[PDB]
């Protein structure tokens, strides 16, 4: 009956011994239970969860550094530290025999590609992707699940990740890990401590499955903004990698290669109707965008493009041409104008650098 | 029915009477009954947990010292505590149970020495971390009345180990939930009490279970967040950090070999010498624990492996001059303000 379905689910997987023992016990208990009862469907849902988890299924990982570097460099400009870390991860997974897992943390100012690089890394490694956002959450149940005794019990987001991704090689992104709750309603950072332990992660048990799951071959990537908020044992468990900002040159390269093309794709405009030269981009960056991230530059580019597109749909023009002389018309008054207050230093003044 | 389960045990009187009453109540009932299912599951659990059987724990001081020294390095007060445990278990002709607590900075080996202590004493090992746990159900269980009820973590541990006197390592005993939902600290205060271990009385089984032979170990990062009646029940043992020399011994004996195995390299492909390791520990890994030194070791071997695979080289050599482009900028500077002091300035050292 249903027991045959569960056995046929389990056949392809390579289950460990304790899991197979628990499954045998549960099938033996289900065999002698009347369908009209609620114990029956409690046990049936437990067997559902126990068999829907991929016990040995691993993704077919890409181990070609050429292809990995190509896919890694066709979606984000800089980030040499991150790209090198991923390439070394690949080289190690190849020099050893099998897949492996790590616990990384990307930290840096807002606007750099801390969140957007994870999906690219997943596509590069040909691993499965899953984004779990812990910003402000206080429910430890979202990490460890609830016991079976309760009515609407569920295993927790990590086990649901494994079930929904059908492999034990996912790239789990934990977004805004320094903004987690830590309140009267719960302190999920401690469960996160038990989850992201480089040595005990091999046997992590949530409270729904009383059996431990091997999360050692899972690529965990936490993204934080500041570090002093993360507690000391977490900071110890993770490998902090700094993703700094960008200088004007890198911002210009980003604008030319990704930001402006994507903004054009969104607004519908092409290079004929509205053209942004490299020189007006350099001027825009110099005069308006002096942050580490690129979100402000993205907003300024889309501002220029909306202003252009509004003249097209009405009768103001058929093509808009942006020059370093009429940039104030689009993005407004410049923000950064002059750097020196003294062109010739009098006897008593001296120019020093300051961070 | 299944009294052979008790034949392979030595059960006490009260649980025997409970099993007999429940077997009668099972006999006078019929199948297809909710009460039949409840009582059958109850007898299943009751006769599942072991009742008088112990593991034949090792009691050889030299063998235990060898197996304890093989795994870690220089946790001397912990190893002495375990050896004294064995000496007492020898002078008294029976098994023994204690309640220890290891507290110290992160990465010093508190959670890692427990499995080695279990290997030494030939006891069974259970971890059961409690970080962030909120509900008492995980310690004590639910009554038989509820559908889907089952005993707590301790009774499931007993059933799984199939023996009393296992070793239970309750992690993060200072990070237990004390918020709105539940307060399992009182359950732990009843469980880790040496005068009430002999009758534990979880909620599912109405019988009391003797837990006096279980060797409990609880790891904590700070004792401040442990309530005083609970600190007063544990033997607080401080696991302090390691100095540069102990860190070097750890790196040579454990860290670098394990990283070699995890990265697929050997000594001939990438050579980490004692002097470059000393320099790494001095300029980068200036902490109390070991995880950061392990991270640096993995970093060096990993960049080595990438250089080899990409075809750049076939054998990497990490020298105290070539270390910079492997681990980055040194977190601490070896050069001092004055290698030769002029008049007026004198070198003093502080704390
Ligand atoms: N080097 C880059 N190349 C191309 N696009 C980039 C680059 N850096 C950032 N971006 C783009 O800029 C935006 C950055 O957003 P992202 O979510 O990565 O920032 P974040 O660091 O996660 O911010 P927060 O601090 O809020 O988490 C994304 O749209 C991303 O596509
Ligand atoms: N003396 C030692 N010899 C060998 N390895 C050690 C030693 N001390 C620590 N380690 C290593 O440190 C790693 C992690 O240590 P562990 O996680 O047990 O520390 P911890 O006290 O649990 O930290 P936390 O308090 O943050 O949980 C282990 O893999 C262990 O091998
Ligand atoms: Mg983000
Ligand atoms: Mg620990």
Residue numbers in the entry:
A (entry chain C): 416 to 770
B (entry chain B): 420 to 770
From the paper:
The substrate-bound LONP1 structure was resolved to ~3.2 Å resolution, which enabled atomic model building and refinement. Whereas the AAA+ ring of bacterial Lon consists of four descending ATPase domains in its spiral staircase with two ascending ‘seam’ subunits, our substrate-bound structure of human LONP1 contains five descending ATPase domain subunits with a single ‘seam’ subunit transitioning between the highest and lowest subunits. Accordingly, the four topmost subunits of the staircase are bound to ATPγS (hereafter referred to as ATP for simplicity) while the lowest subunit contains ADP in its nucleotide-binding site. Density corresponding to an ADP molecule is also observed in the ‘seam’, or transitional subunit. The ATPases in our human LONP1 reconstruction encircle a density accommodating a 12-residue peptide substrate (modeled as a polyalanine chain due to ambiguity of substrate sequence), which is surprisingly nearly twice the length of the engaged substrate visualized in substrate-bound Y. pestis Lon31. Notably, in addition to the pore loop 1 aromatic residue, we identified a second pore loop aromatic residue, Y599, within the AAA+ domains of human LONP1 that also engages the translocating substrate. This second pore loop residue assembles into a spiral that parallels the pore loop 1 aromatic, with Y599 from ATP1 and ATP2 engaged with the trapped substrate. Surprisingly, despite having a peptide substrate tightly bound within the channel, the protease domains of substrate-bound human LONP1 do not adopt a sixfold symmetric configuration. Instead, the protease domains of the substrate-bound hexamer follow the shallow spiraling trajectory of the AAA+ domains, with an opening in the proteolytic ring between ATP1 and ATP2, the two uppermost subunits of the spiral staircase. Further, we observe all six protease active sites to be in an inactive configuration, wherein a loop containing the catalytic serine residue (S855) is folded into a 310 helix, sterically occluding substrate access to the catalytic active site.
The human mitochondrial AAA+ protein LONP1 is a critical quality control protease involved in regulating diverse aspects of mitochondrial biology including proteostasis, electron transport chain activity, and mitochondrial transcription. The LONP1 protease consists of an N-terminal domain involved in substrate recognition and oligomerization, a AAA+ (ATPases associated with diverse cellular activities) domain that powers substrate translocation, and a C-terminal serine protease domain involved in substrate proteolysis. In mammals, LONP1 is a primary quality control protease responsible for regulating proteostasis and various biological functions within the mitochondrial matrix through diverse mechanisms. Here, we determine structures for human LONP1 in three different states: substrate-free, substrate-bound, and both substrate- and bortezomib-bound.
